[PDB]
Write a protein that binds this ligand. Structure first.
Ligand SMILES: Nc1nc(Nc2ccc(S(N)(=O)=O)cc2)sc1C(=O)c1cccc(F)c1
Length: 294
């Protein structure tokens, strides 16, 4: 914008670019997302306004929304690092389990909160989970297709990551449920533990089949109605479910039990964020502080 001094480009959001910026008058440092001509939906901005009144310690605060000049700017409180960079920086030693547990616990609180407010994230991934020196982690870049849409590109030729997409989405479900966020978080949880993406698909079908090769090709037994889904094909190969202890070694049984519930094929059997918070895995949860190199 004009009242902002771009310090540097932080990346590519889901609808545009993200800059670290400084409010030329207040001096506050923020994250500024620039969106996109048609004219911007009203149904969108209102689903956005909802996002403004969404205040929780594990949700990145959306400070302002400016529509002017055939471009949409979203001003967010700024955090210094995303989980993707942190995981990469921790690849050699791995993130300590107490920190992994604390982050998962906080993200479930964040989700429990948005979900109870009928708000879905829709596109959780390490790049949109932000952390601070304080040991907090927050949900960022909500993709609400109800606040806009779920396109095939961010805005200008970018390879969308499908690694965290719930199977029901890949199978053509038109109406996502809060369960899609639990699935994505489950994938992230596994990745923090093993230091390797759980399902690194390179295409929608490869994504689907990597899920199938690991969790078993779903059928009507484990997922009633799956064979009636839009993109389900009787021709899908039939892979057996892999031993789960091979999936996330060396995560303890409480952790594996919880991940297992976050990765249930049936959206209705998949654990809710509220229930996951009560899982025995969190009995000894604490809030360690990360070693952040900024
Ligand atoms: N609030 C906020 N802060 C950020 N800082 C930051 C600082 C450093 C790093 S990094 N690669 O670790 O050096 C990453 C993010 S991004 C962001 C967003 O709200 C956001 C995130 C994703 C997409 C989007 F559209 C907006």
């Amino acid at each position: 914008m004009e009242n902002f001094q771009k310090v540097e480009k932080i990346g590519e959001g889901t609808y545009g670019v993200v800059y670290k910026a400084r409010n030329k008058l207040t001096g506050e440092v923020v994250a500024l997302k620039k969106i996109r001509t048609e004219g911007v939906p009203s149904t969108a901005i209102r689903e956005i306004s909802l996002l403004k009144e969404l205040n929780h310690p594990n949700i990145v605060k959306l400070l302002d929304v400016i529509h002017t000049e055939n471009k949409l700017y979203l001003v967010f409180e700024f955090l210094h690092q995303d989980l993707k960079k942190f995981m990469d920086a921790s690849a050699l030693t791995g993130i300590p389990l107490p920190l992994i547990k604390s982050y998962l616990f906080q993200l479930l609180q964040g989700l429990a909160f948005c979900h109870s407010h009928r708000v879905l994230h829709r596109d959780l991934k390490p790049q949109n989970l932000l952390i601070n020196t304080e040991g907090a982690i927050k949900l960022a870049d909500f993709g609400l297709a109800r606040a806009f849409g779920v396109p095939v590109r961010t805005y200008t030729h970018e390879v969308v990551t499908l690694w965290y997409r719930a199977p029901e989405i890949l199978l053509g479900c038109k109406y996502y449920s809060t369960a899609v966020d639990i699935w994505s978080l489950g994938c992230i949880f596994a990745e923090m533990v093993t230091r390797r993406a759980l399902f690194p698909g390179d295409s929608e079908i490869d994504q689907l089949f990597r899920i199938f090769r690991t969790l078993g090709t779903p059928d009507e037994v484990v997922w009633p109605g799956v064979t009636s889904m839009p993109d389900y094909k009787p021709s899908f190969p039939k892979w057996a479910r892999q031993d789960f202890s091979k999936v996330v070694p060396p995560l303890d049984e409480d952790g594996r039990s919880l991940l297992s519930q976050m990765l249930h094929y049936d959206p209705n059997k998949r654990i809710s964020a509220k229930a996951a918070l009560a899982h025995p895995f969190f009995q000894d949860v604490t809030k360690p502080v990360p070693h952040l190199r900024l």
